[PDB]
Design a protein around this nucleic acid. Sequence first.
RNA 1: AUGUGGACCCGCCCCUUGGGGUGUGUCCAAAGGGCUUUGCCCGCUUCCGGAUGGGCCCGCGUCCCAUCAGCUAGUUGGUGGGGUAAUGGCCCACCAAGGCGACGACGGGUAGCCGGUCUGAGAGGAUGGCCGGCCACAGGGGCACUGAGACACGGGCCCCACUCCUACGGGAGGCAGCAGUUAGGAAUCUUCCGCAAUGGGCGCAAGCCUGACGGAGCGACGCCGCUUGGAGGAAGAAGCCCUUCGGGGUGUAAACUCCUGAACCCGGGACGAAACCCCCGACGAGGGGACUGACGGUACCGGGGUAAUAGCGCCGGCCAACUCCGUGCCAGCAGCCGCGGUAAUACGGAGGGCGCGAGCGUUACCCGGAUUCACUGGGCGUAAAGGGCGUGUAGGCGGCCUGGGGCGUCCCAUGUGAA
Lengths: 138, 104, 124, 208, 83, 99
Amino acid sequence: MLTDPIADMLTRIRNATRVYKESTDVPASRFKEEILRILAREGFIKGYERVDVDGKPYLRVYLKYGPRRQGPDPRPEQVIHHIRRISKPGRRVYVGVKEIPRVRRGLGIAILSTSKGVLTDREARKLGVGGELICEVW
Amino acid sequence: PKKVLTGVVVSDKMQKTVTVLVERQFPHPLYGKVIKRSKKYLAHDPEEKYKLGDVVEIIESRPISKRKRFRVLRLVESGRMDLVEKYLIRRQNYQSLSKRGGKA
Amino acid sequence: PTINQLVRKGREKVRKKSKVPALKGAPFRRGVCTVVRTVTPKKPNSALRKVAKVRLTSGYEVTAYIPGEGHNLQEHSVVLIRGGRVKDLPGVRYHIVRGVYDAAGVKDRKKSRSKYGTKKPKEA
Amino acid sequence: GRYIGPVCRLCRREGVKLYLKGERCYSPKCAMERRPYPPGQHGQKRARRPSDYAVRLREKQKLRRIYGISERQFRNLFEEASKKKGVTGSVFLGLLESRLDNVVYRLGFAVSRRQARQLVRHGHITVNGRRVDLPSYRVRPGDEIAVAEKSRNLELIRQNLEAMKGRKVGPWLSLDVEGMKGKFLRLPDREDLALPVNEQLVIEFYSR
Amino acid sequence: MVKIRLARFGSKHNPHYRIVVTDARRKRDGKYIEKIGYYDPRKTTPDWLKVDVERARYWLSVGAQPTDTARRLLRQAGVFRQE
Amino acid sequence: RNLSALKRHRQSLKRRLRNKAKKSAIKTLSKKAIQLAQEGKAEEALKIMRKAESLIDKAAKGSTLHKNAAARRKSRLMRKVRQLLEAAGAPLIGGGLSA
RNA sequence: AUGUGGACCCGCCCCUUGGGGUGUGUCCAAAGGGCUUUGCCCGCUUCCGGAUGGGCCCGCGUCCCAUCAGCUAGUUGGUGGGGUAAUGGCCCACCAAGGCGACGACGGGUAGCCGGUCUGAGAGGAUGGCCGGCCACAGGGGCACUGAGACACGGGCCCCACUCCUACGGGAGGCAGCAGUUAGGAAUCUUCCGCAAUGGGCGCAAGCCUGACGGAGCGACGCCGCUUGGAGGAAGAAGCCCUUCGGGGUGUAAACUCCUGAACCCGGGACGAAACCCCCGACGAGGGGACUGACGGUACCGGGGUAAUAGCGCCGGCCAACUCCGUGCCAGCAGCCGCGGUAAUACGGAGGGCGCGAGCGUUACCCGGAUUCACUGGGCGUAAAGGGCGUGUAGGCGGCCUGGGGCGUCCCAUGUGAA
Ligand SMILES: [Mg+2]
Ligand SMILES: [Mg+2]
Ligand SMILES: [Mg+2]
Ligand SMILES: [Mg+2]
Ligand SMILES: [Mg+2]
Ligand SMILES: [Mg+2]
Ligand SMILES: [Mg+2]
Ligand SMILES: [Mg+2]
Ligand SMILES: [Mg+2]
Ligand SMILES: [Mg+2]
Ligand SMILES: [Mg+2]
Ligand SMILES: [Mg+2]
Ligand SMILES: [Mg+2]
Ligand SMILES: [Mg+2]
Ligand SMILES: [Mg+2]
Ligand SMILES: [Mg+2]
Ligand SMILES: [Mg+2]
Ligand SMILES: [Mg+2]
Ligand SMILES: [Mg+2]
Ligand SMILES: [Mg+2]
Ligand SMILES: [Mg+2]
Ligand SMILES: [Mg+2]
Ligand SMILES: [Mg+2]
Ligand SMILES: [Mg+2]
Ligand SMILES: [Mg+2]
Ligand SMILES: [Mg+2]
Ligand SMILES: [Mg+2]
Ligand SMILES: [Mg+2]
Ligand SMILES: [Mg+2]
Ligand SMILES: [Mg+2]
Ligand SMILES: [Mg+2]
Ligand SMILES: [Mg+2]
Ligand SMILES: [Mg+2]
Ligand SMILES: [Mg+2]
Ligand SMILES: [Zn+2]
């Protein structure tokens, strides 16, 4: 069985960008959606759509990359340098609003789930709520 | 506020007393992970009324014997022996764990 | 190890093994000399190193190096001990304090004098 | 301690012109003048590339000997400038400059800090009127540092404060030559001090 | 019974007391019930006696029992306005 | 030697005896009352229960009992007396009891 | 005897565990003293309330060993009774046969716990010394009495061990109170002053008692402040440096140029102490000079005044500082790597240098560096590490959608988090 589906998605993305795929298919959930919603809004992907694949629902995910570079290795800078699952099954991680961390001095974000819905670090502190802390992304 | 626990009766084999099993989940001091953990309370049952299986509310009371300090407040839901069986098998393991074998 | 494993088993801490049972973890032990033998060194050293077997008030019987040039340690001279591994004689892990009790402090030493326990030369 | 020994051997080891002899260090015989090699019988041989420790160490001794102070008192001042809010490198220099033995020397009551030090100890200096005889007393701002009434007619002062006619003083002191009473206006900033010292090193030395 | 008295808190040769409600059976400098003021017998500072005068009269109302010294100090702050 | 608060000892002894007797009087009367009830002799049992009540409440005037200790002792008493009587008695003199 | 009232059994109502009201019955009070005497002071009795102090119960937390895995007879529960201020197997008789344990029971080892303390970037590690809170003990073991409170350090009884008295039957003791002696030990203080201050016990008060305390004494044991002010050459009866009995350094560094003046002398000289008491006013009235200082003639102020202690470690790399002679795997050094075998910056001396300075070194122990037990934050093909392989018990973990609950989780308010 797939134990942590959220972790799988983050990996699935990490894995796709390193070989510079155009887009990648991740099995769909209302939850994985509310993450991409953020991932998209904060400029890390071009966006996502709800393609069906042999009848079963996925989420195509259009990845972004930097400009073509020069010298040896022209491959572009990634837009997602780094993406890490933080609360994992059987080591769940919750933060209070006071404990919400500053990722990359704020050149990066930290998606987290709250009883006010899924938000970024800035989103949550402005809103004065903590919650389960899903992942880092910078 | 006199403390109030909620639990499962796992024993009816006493005169006017019922062993209640109270489970409590808290996260671990250093390792963060949530761990379930539990304790058995002897509760006063003045009318041998509560039967093995149900889920009761337990309440902090003036002492009634050595290690018997709670009275059985109200009843939550009726029967469910699954909880007892869980608690039963757990016990049965001990039959092994000695010098020979036993029941797995 | 998994988190769960860690929760079940824990880490296990470290134990200090002390290279001086001068007992009490006292800083000095008084002792009565038994032998005042001489001993040979190892690995790539040669000489005749002045050692002493000592009977301790901590109820111990340990060899202990006698630092300095000349010593005056008879078969029964009483003496103080401090920690100190002599790299060369193995099994010698204490020093005799030159200057306390029966051990006279090295004579005519002008340089590093607080070790070797010698008074300020009377150059006044 | 107070060091209290041959001062110009320290002018020489640290390598920069130092004002410990206060008066004489302006004449062509400061010994640093036309003999600027270190003390000892290796004074004039070629010196190898110093370790980073050396560099930091020397830069620290350089500072501490300027103000003539036991390392005890010095490290106490430094930890206190760390704990303190504000760029910690230069809070140090401000505390160091706030020492009475030093503020007396700044106002040219004395020619050396050393001299100024013994001037305080002998109760020749007042502060807000009252007598103070601690070289380490800390001058706060607003404080008026006077010369002792009974000491007013003393030799060294008559001489020293007369030569102070004309001369200017740092823009944090306000000396008045008539009645011999300067005022401590302000804690000096790093640009105010022309100390031949890189305190960044000094910090870095205790950063070990 | 419960008393109001002076508990010593200075330094050697430098006394400062705290005016204190406490059970009399207590250590002099031990655990008290409530601080209700202080006293600097040497008046080294312009503020050398201070009494929470409302609170002083509270404890008095339920049988707090001032030392003869404490009463001085209390009198001075004008606890019992003998007018 | 000789701290003259061994006087306290002398007194302790003196008192010890006063309490000791006061209690035996209660114990012997209370017993007697119960044992009278358990025979249906009701008038005799109350005439004596009543003595025992008094002595008890009295006992508690000094330090021999004081307290709920005496209250207890009375509660245990009149309750027992009524029951041994209620095995067919009909509280004749009805001194200490209220029916 | 009086019953304001209160206790107890039976009822009646409210309450809800034994909280409060009520009725018949029963039971239960007391102490005198002083007067500046018939009216004040301190007392005495019952009851209700407050305040302070305390008993008991509960949740959660609280080291190591599984080479300790099974434990338990008042043991677990019950009815009744004893006992207590009071709940309770606390104790007792009887009845049921339960209670506990791998979420570590039972056993063994170690230890007073905490506020805090040291360390650390932190998470964490280590610790419980001063001071403050609680607990336990008072030569060892048991026990009750007295009392509001003790199972009572300077109270009682009994047994044991040790010491002293002994007319040999029998008696006396108990510094882990202040000081002190002795032993043990690397090592730990005066048989000091004082009742003036604060605090306590009793007294109406005057007072009394207080080794509580406030002070002084010893010990660089720790911290902080402070002094030793600083301007000049160098003949070896075994002892002033550096190319063979030789080239510069020590160094502006002096036994002597002024200047200031630690010690030491002389004079003044304290805060801490205003209440208790008396007096007017009512026995707390802005009146008390009613009087009170161990520390102490000390601190502090003023006058006089002498140029006036410097040590200890280090100099091969780590690690700031190098030369000469002696020595020749010797004597020795050494925290690790290592130095010494005739040219040693590493041993011993010397000159010179570096660090710190009334201290400087050594030993010892804790945290650190050590991401070297890794939660933060490590690993296991060959470096140490995949169980010889399976099955599956307990446990850990769990795909997509919707609805309730709100245990985890998040937020706001509040109470506590003493000093
Ligand atoms: Mg008496
Ligand atoms: Mg009567
Ligand atoms: Mg112990
Ligand atoms: Mg660390
Ligand atoms: Mg003893
Ligand atoms: Mg005993
Ligand atoms: Mg009493
Ligand atoms: Mg009693
Ligand atoms: Mg006791
Ligand atoms: Mg005693
Ligand atoms: Mg003693
Ligand atoms: Mg000895
Ligand atoms: Mg002492
Ligand atoms: Mg008093
Ligand atoms: Mg004292
Ligand atoms: Mg006065
Ligand atoms: Mg008096
Ligand atoms: Mg070097
Ligand atoms: Mg050496
Ligand atoms: Mg040689
Ligand atoms: Mg050498
Ligand atoms: Mg060396
Ligand atoms: Mg000092
Ligand atoms: Mg660590
Ligand atoms: Mg890890
Ligand atoms: Mg490793
Ligand atoms: Mg191999
Ligand atoms: Mg291997
Ligand atoms: Mg295998
Ligand atoms: Mg399973
Ligand atoms: Mg599950
Ligand atoms: Mg799920
Ligand atoms: Mg909830
Ligand atoms: Mg809070
Ligand atoms: Zn100079």
